[PDB]
Design a protein around this ligand. Structure first.
Ligand code: HEM
Ligand code: HEM
Ligand SMILES: [Cl-]
Lengths: 362, 361
């Protein structure tokens, strides 16, 4: 065994866990009618995820060769590649069209609502929302896709799949901050995910939420198109100015080191770093780049960021950033948000329990 | 050092060990003069050399008012066995009966659109193209970085026709990589380290324009794979479709993946049976793709970027295509939605540029 990340724990993996290279990110709508159908679904997803992340090798026997294989096979020879699978629920899981579909509204999390419309949104409704999100990460795309596929396979009959995105973010060979598609290092401003205390104040829900959220968090999702062709033709100055860091070093303007503190009065008031840091709030950003062939509409490379961030309180920590950035981020010149969602992520699973058990009345 | 020589007798990325990631693009030349194309090929040479060598694109950082020459996302990354391969389609040589660039006298012997086959549902905008670029690396970000910087240099000269990307992970202990059907992919290929076998299967050695010497032809097919129909099929149906066992990858009746196929032991209509029975060899070097939900099926949109190399597509590849399109069991679970044939020049010598002998220095 080698690249394994415990599935069971105080929290779900794939949040504070070291950033893997690949993500597959899916949203589902529950079409089933009874909570018991959903319990079944969550039960099976638990077994299978445990199996997948542990590197438990599925086969060996597979009796009755007239039956479908229970596993799709393409990961048979592959390392678990730090596979994590994270689950969350959107507003619509709890209340859809003013109806409480599953008797769950009394256990609705404190901060779970659609994100407010923002300026420069060009949201595709079908590229956001959804009853359930599944975030699958691994250091190997094939491993990640294998997981999503086997998980989605189990949801046939109960859910319809709403969207499946995938992305990548390679870190440096020597552990440097991974660079996004704008050539800039991404994640410098995050607090240390290995600092349990900082993660408890930023990410982890500890109280003031339904019990099933304890050791959970909220996940904000934004699919943000990045106009590479316009960016690439911009001067280095314009690029650096857009962010308030230098491209190479990743250092804040005026500072020498990437990890030096940002000096606010040294970067434009309209820079991405400036706007986000002001407001004074912290989130845990854990984004991945995407490319999706040619945009049929522009004829250019369809590319962007799968912005994913975790926060114990999206209203206090994330939305104010979103408000500030959408107003006058210099970055707005080179990006546009085309998908949006907010998910509530349950606390971790204890061995012998299933995901979100405490939410569907065990 | 995860570097693969760019310069050599052949272009890299053909017999070179299969990397995990590919970006596969086609371009149309919109420029009018050969000299524009020479410039394009000259620049692509410098940049490819630079990129594949792991030369870290630096030296200075001045004139902050200019766009940076390099996009930067690969700054911290190993070259990850980056290879970049170039080829040309029929349309490079002749468009509308006219010879666009004075190149028809050096047209390769076998370069034509593949014939339409039964079951084809070709999207014309998912195939053809004047120039293909195949970018492979063990790291998607490195591969995308290369394509992007290469395409960036083509602005003004070409328009991009399509960009595909795919993956195919080999086992932790070097097993044959499995495609999205869970089956090992490439067992039947001869050894790419057997120079003689590669000379008879892949490499052009004579009877072609001189710029093709140590070149090859690249057949491309974008083949959708219906994962949801496959997944619901019995193991028997799956194994029967191919004529090998899923796990071992061994031919029916044999114990080992590399044991010889015994034809009278696998269905008449199995993929392996029909392909082998043509008596012909190709070099398959495919990658899986996923592209989100198909808006039409509502399922995963997934398949194979089938890429194969052969010295003579008319003798080696087309007869396979004929046989398989007729009655391959696999036709139940796949459908070809893009097609192209490209002629790949011989390798570049240091101080020369790609396809120079065709464009005449
Ligand atoms: C929901 C939208 C986004 C939010 C809420 C957001 C938020 C943030 C935050 C909080 C920081 C750290 C600032 C600090 O406290 O020091 C940051 C930095 C940064 N963001 Fe974003 N961001 C968003 C979208 C994007 C996009 C589309 C890009 C494009 C690549 C991007 C690139 C960067 C870069 C390069 C930095 C450098 C600072 C760092 O990561 O340490 N962000 N962003
Ligand atoms: C129509 C395009 C294709 C052609 C021309 C083609 C050709 C071939 C050839 C020549 C072989 C070697 C057989 C032998 O001599 O032992 C082979 C084997 C195989 N093909 Fe294909 N193939 C095609 C499409 C596909 C697709 C879409 C898949 C998967 C979806 C696939 C999966 C396989 C597998 C699993 C094997 C056996 C393992 C191996 O020896 O490579 N093929 N194919
Ligand atoms: Cl699917």
């Amino acid at each position: 065994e080698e690249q394994i990340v415990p599935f069971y724990g105080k929290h779900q993996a794939g949040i504070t866990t070291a950033h893997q290279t690949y993500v597959y990110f899916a949203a589902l709508d529950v079409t089933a009618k009874e909570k018991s159908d959903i319990i079944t679904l969550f039960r099976n997803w638990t077994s299978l995820t445990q199996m997948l992340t542990s590197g438990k090798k599925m086969s060996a026997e597979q009796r009755n060769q007239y039956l479908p294989p229970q596993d799709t096979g393409e990961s048979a020879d592959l390392s678990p590649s730090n596979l994590t699978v994270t689950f969350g629920f959107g507003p619509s899981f709890f209340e859809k069209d003013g109806k409480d579909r599953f008797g769950l509204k009394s256990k609705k999390p404190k901060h779970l609502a659609a994100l407010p419309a923002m300026p420069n949104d060009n949201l595709d409704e079908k590229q956001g929302g959804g009853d359930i999100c599944i975030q699958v990460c691994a250091d190997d795309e094939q491993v990640a896709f294998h997981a999503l596929r086997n998980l989605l396979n189990q949801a046939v009959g109960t859910c319809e799949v709403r969207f499946v995105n995938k992305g990548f973010l390679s870190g440096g060979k020597n552990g440097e901050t991974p660079r996004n598609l704008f050539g800039f290092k991404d994640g410098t401003g995050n607090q240390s995910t290995e600092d349990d205390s900082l993660m408890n104040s930023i990410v982890w829900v500890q109280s003031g939420e339904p019990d099933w959220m304890t050791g959970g968090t909220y996940m904000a999702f934004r699919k943000i198109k990045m106009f590479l062709e316009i960016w690439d033709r911009s001067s280095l100055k314009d690029q650096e100015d857009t962010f308030g860091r230098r491209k190479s070093s990743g250092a804040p303007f005026g500072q020498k080191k990437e990890t030096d503190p940002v000096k606010l009065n040294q970067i434009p008031s309209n820079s991405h770093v400036s706007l986000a840091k002001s407001t004074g709030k912290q989130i845990l950003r854990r984004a991945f780049s995407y490319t999706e062939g040619l945009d049929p509409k522009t004829g250019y490379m369809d590319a962007g960021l799968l912005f994913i961030s975790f926060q114990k309180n999206p209203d206090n920590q994330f939305i104010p950033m979103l408000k500030a950035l959408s107003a006058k981020d210099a970055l707005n010149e080179y990006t546009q948000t085309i998908g949006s969602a907010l998910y509530a992520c349950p606390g971790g699973c204890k061995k012998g329990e299933y995901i979100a058990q405490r939410l569907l009345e065990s």
